[PDB]
Structure 1
């Protein structure tokens, strides 16, 4: 149900895929599962991803459910693969059939490196999928599950700084699973109640205006003090 390129990426051997594409293999040919060799490369190895992209592969190749390779790279937490894809011209706001942008998946799993790399390229934290789970909502659910370590806490900090302001309450009530963790419920209530500092709002507006660019390079062109540049890049 899969062509040799698919198996070569499964074994995650960059050399084999390179020598196979050197003779003119159809890189973008789809297999039985509606996957592309880029999808397999973007789940295992960055070197294979680069080799595959070297031959005009579609970094937006849609799978059976329109899960672009970036989605799988983010979900698997392959930070290097995600960077290689995005730098190569991937759609950092690509939506699958459930409107799950790659940032939504990364936050859902809670990993941090991929979330940071995405936000560096201008991922929109305010994205809402069809069901209605923002990246922050999924990360907060994960934290409530008790699996959240300091890594997940830092990822939540990054998301909260980037989003500018987030309100998890349903009308006047927090989600049930949150309500059963009194200290975390208190923290979320205090975070949500505050309107938010003017500086964070301005930073979010500037980021949105700069969106869809390698933000550090873009902000380097701005005339602000380096402190405010670091602030814009979510270093404070």
Structure 2
């Protein structure tokens, strides 16, 4: 079959496999489905796997050379789609492949902004809180004050507004800034295997992976 052929919806079969199950994704990638294949909006199979939170499908795609920072016409990365649902497993997998957290879509939203929005709407379980913690570790530091002011929705939630404003107003520890610079230098590769060769204490090797 012309595995890279677009159907009439102009989606690749890999866009369906990434939404259903990792066995199909593996079959299509093994038969040379383009992991960067672009649908009618450009969104790759990896964006859909992240949005479906198909953690093992996201893995099976990234491990076969999907562009972890692929961009759609909005310039949403797959992390910008995982983070809008706060779904922890796919965010963690993307960050282990060095997905960039400091991305901004053309609307102007970063993944952290989208997650803070989800938390302000009170749909956040402990899973969203863990995801926000993981992103705050990954980013090193973030800012949400626009004109010194939290986005108007956040101001509706005083406990979250105080937490975020204090997190913003701290310059961040030098340790986490070093962690970010190291992760940035390792770049688009499987971090929890690239770090193993580094000359570091093993506790810092684990810290670089955001596990601490």
Give the TM-score category using the shorter length: over 0.9
Q: Deviations over 1:19-65 (max 9, x none)?
A: xxxxxx11111111110000000000100000111111100000000
Cα offset, 1:202, TM superposition: 0.3
Cα offset, 1:95, TM superposition: 0.1
1:131-210 correspondence to structure 2 within 5 Å: 131-210=107-186
* Structure whose CA Rg is larger: 1
Q: How many residues align?
A: 212
List alignment gaps of at least 5 residues for structure 1.
1-24
The structure 2 residue matched to 1:113, chosen from 89, 96, 102, is 89
Q: TM-score under structure 1 normalisation?
A: 0.89
- Separation in 1, partners of 2:16, 2:158: 43
Q: Secondary structure at the match of 1:62?
A: coil
- Separation in 2, partners of 1:63, 1:183: 41
Q: Secondary structure at the match of 1:88?
A: coil
Cα offset, 1:103, TM superposition: 0.2
Alignment match, 2:73: 97
The structure 2 residue matched to 1:47, chosen from 14, 23, 37, is 23
Runs of 4+ aligned residues of structure 1 deviating over 6 Å after TM superposition are none
Alignment match, 1:35: 11
Cα offset, 1:180, TM superposition: 1.0
Cα offset, 1:181, TM superposition: 0.7
Cα offset, 1:211, TM superposition: 1.1
Q: Deviations over 1:126-180 (max 9, x none)?
A: 0000001000000000000000010000000000000000001112111000001
Q: Deviations over 1:85-140 (max 9, x none)?
A: 00000000000000000000000011000000000000000000000100000000
Q: Deviations over 1:53-89 (max 9, x none)?
A: 1111100000000000000000000000000000000
- Separation in 2, partners of 1:208, 1:142: 27
CA RMSD of aligned residues (A): 0.5
Cα offset, 1:214, TM superposition: 0.3
Q: TM-score under structure 2 normalisation?
A: 0.99
- Separation in 2, partners of 1:54, 1:31: 20
- Separation in 2, partners of 1:43, 1:56: 18
Cα offset, 1:192, TM superposition: 0.3
